Design a protein around this ligand. Structure first.
Ligand SMILES: *[C@@H]1O[C@H](CO)[C@@H](O[C@@H]2O[C@H](CO)[C@@H](O)[C@H](O)[C@H]2NC(C)=O)[C@H](O)[C@H]1NC(C)=O
Ligand SMILES: *[C@@H]1O[C@H](CO)[C@@H](O[C@@H]2O[C@H](CO)[C@@H](O)[C@H](O)[C@H]2NC(C)=O)[C@H](O)[C@H]1NC(C)=O
Ligand SMILES: *[C@@H]1O[C@H](CO)[C@@H](O[C@@H]2O[C@H](CO)[C@@H](O)[C@H](O)[C@H]2NC(C)=O)[C@H](O)[C@H]1NC(C)=O
Ligand SMILES: *[C@@H]1O[C@H](CO)[C@@H](O[C@@H]2O[C@H](CO)[C@@H](O)[C@H](O)[C@H]2NC(C)=O)[C@H](O)[C@H]1NC(C)=O
Ligand SMILES: *[C@@H]1O[C@H](CO)[C@@H](O[C@@H]2O[C@H](CO)[C@@H](O)[C@H](O)[C@H]2NC(C)=O)[C@H](O)[C@H]1NC(C)=O
Ligand SMILES: *[C@@H]1O[C@H](CO)[C@@H](O)[C@H](O)[C@H]1NC(C)=O
Ligand SMILES: *[C@@H]1O[C@H](CO)[C@@H](O)[C@H](O)[C@H]1NC(C)=O
Ligand SMILES: *[C@@H]1O[C@H](CO)[C@@H](O)[C@H](O)[C@H]1NC(C)=O
Ligand SMILES: *[C@@H]1O[C@H](CO)[C@@H](O)[C@H](O)[C@H]1NC(C)=O
Ligand SMILES: *[C@@H]1O[C@H](CO)[C@@H](O)[C@H](O)[C@H]1NC(C)=O
Ligand SMILES: *[C@@H]1O[C@H](CO)[C@@H](O)[C@H](O)[C@H]1NC(C)=O
Lengths: 264, 367, 98, 28, 49
């Protein structure tokens, strides 16, 4: 099935200042108390990042992927449920799908034919308490395939109702010679609408040998075709640059703080 | 040591003084190799006996991982024509661990094999397939007129004939859009200065040497930046700790003593380094402990001798070495902050210095 | 007593001595750092090239390392001589004050 | 560790302290 | 040229006062030997002699 969810009012995006985030391990080599420096595609400090917010509010536009993108979102009830990566997103060329809805972190690499506004429909909105994927509108066709990955199945919790956000989700996407390196860090925070203040490292979660061309990307939003209610969710998008950084490794060994060379 | 100091002073008599010589070293007691518990064989058999090779303009790249490889069969096989390596030694492939393995499948004209090498030039090396300047690996090819070439003409091995610009290493294009080589813009499927970007190899068994199709395989890999996934046919041996050994971890050679490490390695980290940016801690591929690495003691050998005429007895000093090292010759041993001392009788009653030693010690000749 | 307090006052009062020990550490740290550079070679670990290349092809690659690494000692050792001469002149000044 | 070595000075911190004490003793 | 002399009487044809298109020479496959020693083959189109 395939339905256009244009249940959104035309609102321009917003901006917030990326203070100290977007710092990830440049290599798989351990150091301790070393003031090592490295050059790599990095997000410069104190950068306006495009701000999105889901509330009714269904801001799901297509965003370009020019030279790496840093993503973050303060998450509650696991609203965000996947991402889309590719270069054409019309089954003409190769495309990437990453989905972590409730059970599987499934990654598939096929020339999928998507909807105009792809998503995953979740049933049982304001009735008997449950949340399960009813409308599978992410793609329609699976013409040819080249790769797939499946993590161990699980059962995450999609329940809760609180007055403030309790979980932060960070993810870094970049393709160097076709390797979709993933750097993530989850931090339990207590804020309302602002990006957390502080510094955190980004461990390499997974690195994939996909080796496909990528230009633009999209995210997944979870929910008779029209009309439903969404919770309060926001996320940000930042862009990396070829900027040299200084990295501090504590005596035990991990990134303690980072110093942007060309900031000031 | 008397002969050594004579040799290093270039005289058959040496004055009463302390002279340096060749520095002491602890030889490695044995050799140990550490490899992961991998036993399944790499699919090089199917890689090199694949029935159909993709057209070079759409050359197929296949990944190979988590397997055991033996490139010796390919090296020694006479069925192959040109096995030229560029970053590694062909016989030295078989004692190294590789992070990732690329298999590139494509068939070109035999006369065009020279253009596959890194840094080459030509229409094929520009917009069919190419290598970076720093290619690490080998190239292998062999004639295939016996099977690929057909009497009716093996025209199915297409390739790009036109391109706007020279593409990048390991970059492929599939779109067959009509090329607007001429000044005028163009569309449609044909036209003057509107040329199809493809033209096809014509392969028949009747063609002479050099023009026949060659089944070409290009092997690409990277070393020492990622955890080992493909390793050679070397067999792991039992680990020996706190002894000077010629250790080998996934190809990372070295020389020193291996000890257990208290540094907390994250699961993705396997290579540890110091402020010197040189390996000092490695995770054993067999079991996931952390092994500290340190080269066992080496120090200067400063011979302490009186005048040659006065005496021939000599006291050998090992600079900055604990006496728990080399024995006697090449029951009278002393420890100094400057190092271990052999051949001297330590005494408590003091005199004026004659031969400086280190950390306030001085040697002298007396009953 | 002022000498007691003046010495106790600032930690930079001993800069005439601190800079000396810092610089040899700086030169050594710079000298040590050189081993991590490639000087145009395929690697920076002399054991790597030996295992990575044969006898007749590596023999030129170590030649790349041997030039830069040795030239670093010339730069390092010479820079030690001038400092050694500087200290030697200062010591003679100290001896006269002694 | 890579051929870098620090050889201790011949005069130890105690003796030079005694030297300074000797130098000061005669001075006063 | 219809006739080329041998190696002893190799003819010299000085070329001057013209704009030279070396790109078409580079692209044509009719030339079996193509190697440059002092310059790069691709950039003959960007220099003046
Ligand atoms: C959502 O709306 C878009 C248009 O805003 C639809 O795209 C059109 O699809 C039709 C039929 O597939 C084409 O004939 C049009 O050319 C498309 N428009 C454009 C601008 O290309 C899309 O199909 C809609 N999706 C759904 C599920 O209804
Ligand atoms: C990756 O895909 C993008 C588009 O998805 C390619 O960029 C296009 O390039 C062509 C010709 O260079 C242009 O006509 C298009 O306008 C470009 N589109 C965009 C969105 O930029 C890009 O060349 C591809 N790269 C690789 C290596 O395949
Ligand atoms: C991507 O998937 C499409 C869908 O099948 C493949 O298209 C087929 O290609 C073969 C090869 O010539 C044709 O014989 C079929 O007719 C094509 N299918 C259709 C529906 O036209 C395509 O080959 C796949 N991509 C690759 C690289 O194999
Ligand atoms: C070693 O890494 C851990 C990372 O969590 C840290 O050590 C912790 O230090 C605190 C403060 O004393 C203790 O309460 C914890 O019990 C320690 N945890 C562990 C696992 O040891 C610290 O970042 C590193 N250690 C030091 C000394 O910096
Ligand atoms: C030379 O090495 C020996 C042993 O490796 C050192 O002996 C140790 O001495 C300390 C205190 O002096 C004891 O606590 C240890 O138990 C001793 N080691 C052993 C194995 O018993 C010796 O100290 C070293 N030399 C110097 C000058 O420190
Ligand atoms: C980010 O961009 C917006 C508009 O594009 C601008 O108003 C804002 O000042 C920028 N950020 C900073 C830190 O100036
Ligand atoms: C009532 O709850 C059950 C739970 O098993 C669910 O299957 C059913 O769909 C619910 N009823 C409606 C009308 O959704
Ligand atoms: C992993 O290595 C250990 C140590 O040799 C061995 O006992 C074990 O069988 C290996 N695992 C497998 C699956 O073979
Ligand atoms: C391919 O098959 C032939 C059988 O004739 C065999 O001799 C050869 O070893 C095979 N090649 C590989 C790489 O297995
Ligand atoms: C060594 O000493 C003896 C006397 O003790 C003397 O005869 C001899 O000449 C000395 N050696 C040299 C080389 O002068
Ligand atoms: C030096 O004195 C210590 C006691 O302080 C004694 O144990 C040692 O045997 C003495 N050595 C000599 C050579 O007199």
């Amino acid at each position: 099935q395939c339905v256009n969810l244009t249940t959104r009012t035309q609102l321009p995006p917003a901006y917030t200042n990326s203070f100290t985030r977007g710092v990830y391990y440049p290599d798989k080599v351990f150091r301790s108390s070393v003031l090592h420096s490295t050059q790599d595609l990095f997000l410069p400090f104190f950068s306006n990042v495009t701000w999105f917010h889901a509330i009714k509010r269904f801001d799901n536009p297509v965003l370009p992927f020019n030279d790496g993108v840093y993503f973050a979102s303060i998450e509650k009830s696991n609203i965000i449920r996947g991402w889309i990566f590719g270069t054409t997103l019309d089954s003409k060329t190769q495309s990437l799908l990453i989905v972590n809805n409730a059970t599987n972190v499934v990654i598939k690499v096929c020339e999928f034919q998507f909807c105009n506004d792809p998503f995953l429909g979740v049933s049982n909105h304001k009735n008997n308490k449950s949340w399960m994927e009813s409308e599978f509108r992410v793609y329609s066709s699976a013409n040819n395939c080249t790769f797939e990955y499946v993590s161990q199945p699980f059962l995450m919790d999609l329940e809760g109702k609180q007055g403030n956000f309790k979980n932060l989700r960070e993810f870094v996407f970049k393709n160097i010679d076709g390797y979709f390196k993933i750097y993530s860090k989850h931090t339990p925070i207590n804020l309302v609408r602002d990006l957390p203040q502080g510094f955190s490292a980004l461990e390499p979660l997974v690195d994939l040998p996909i080796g496909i061309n990528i230009t633009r990307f999209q995210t997944l939003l979870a929910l008779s075709s029209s009309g439903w209610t969404a919770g309060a969710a926001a996320y940000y998008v930042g862009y990396l640059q070829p900027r040299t950084f200084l990295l501090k490794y504590n005596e035990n060994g991990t990134i303690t703080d980072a110093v942007d060379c060309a900031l000031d | 040591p008397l002969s050594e100091t004579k040799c290093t002073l270039k005289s058959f008599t040496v004055e009463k003084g302390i002279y340096q010589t060749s520095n002491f070293r602890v030889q490695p007691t044995e050799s140990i190799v550490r490899f992961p518990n991998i036993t399944n064989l790499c699919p090089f058999g199917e890689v090199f006996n694949a029935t159909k090779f993709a057209s070079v303009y759409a050359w197929n790249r296949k990944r190979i991982s988590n397997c055991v490889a033996d490139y010796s069969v390919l090296y020694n096989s006479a069925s192959f024509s040109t096995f030229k390596c560029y970053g590694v030694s062909p016989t030295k492939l078989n004692d190294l661990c590789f992070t990732n393995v690329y298999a590139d499948s494509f068939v070109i004209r035999g006369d065009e094999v020279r253009q596959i090498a890194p840094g080459q030039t030509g229409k094929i090396a520009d917009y069919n397939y190419k290598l970076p300047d720093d290619f690490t690996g080998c190239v292998i090819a062999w004639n295939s007129n016996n099977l690929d070439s057909k009497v009716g003409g093996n025209y199915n091995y297409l390739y790009r004939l036109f391109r706007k610009s020279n593409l990048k290493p390991f970059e492929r294009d599939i779109s067959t859009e009509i090329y607007q080589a001429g000044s005028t813009p163009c569309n449609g499927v044909k036209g003057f200065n509107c040329y199809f970007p493809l033209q096809s190899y014509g392969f028949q068994p009747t063609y002479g040497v050099g023009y026949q199709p060659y089944r070409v395989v290009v092997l690409s890999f990277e070393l020492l930046h990622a955890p080992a996934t493909v390793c050679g046919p070397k067999k792991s041996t039992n680990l020996v700790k706190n002894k000077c050994v010629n250790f080998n971890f996934n190809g990372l050679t070295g020389t020193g003593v291996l000890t257990e490490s208290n540094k907390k390695f994250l699961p993705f980290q396997q290579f540890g380094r110091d402020i010197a940016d040189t390996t000092d801690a490695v995770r054993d591929p067999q079991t996931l402990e952390i092994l500290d690495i340190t080269p066992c003691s080496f120090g200067g050998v400063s011979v302490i001798t009186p005048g040659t005429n006065t005496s021939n007895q000599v006291a050998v000093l090992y600079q900055g070495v604990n006496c728990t090292e080399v024995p006697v010759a090449i029951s009278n041993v002393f420890q100094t902050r400057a190092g271990c001392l052999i051949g001297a009788e330590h005494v408590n009653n003091s005199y004026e210095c004659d031969i400086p030693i280190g950390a306030g010690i001085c040697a002298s000749y007396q009953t | 007593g002022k000498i007691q307090d003046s010495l106790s006052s600032t930690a930079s009062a001993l800069g005439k001595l601190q800079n000396v020990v810092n610089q040899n550490a700086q030169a050594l740290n710079t000298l040590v750092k050189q081993l991590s550079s490639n000087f145009g070679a395929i690697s920076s670990v002399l054991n790597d090239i030996l295992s990575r290349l044969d006898k007749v092809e590596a023999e030129v690659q170590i030649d790349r390392l041997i030039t830069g690494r040795l030239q670093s000692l010339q730069t390092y050792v010479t820079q030690q001589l001038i400092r050694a001469a500087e200290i030697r002149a200062s010591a003679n000044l100290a001896a006269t004050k002694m | 560790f890579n051929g870098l070595t620090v050889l201790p000075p011949l005069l130890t911190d105690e003796m030079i302290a005694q030297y300074t004490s000797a130098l000061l003793a005669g001075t006063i």
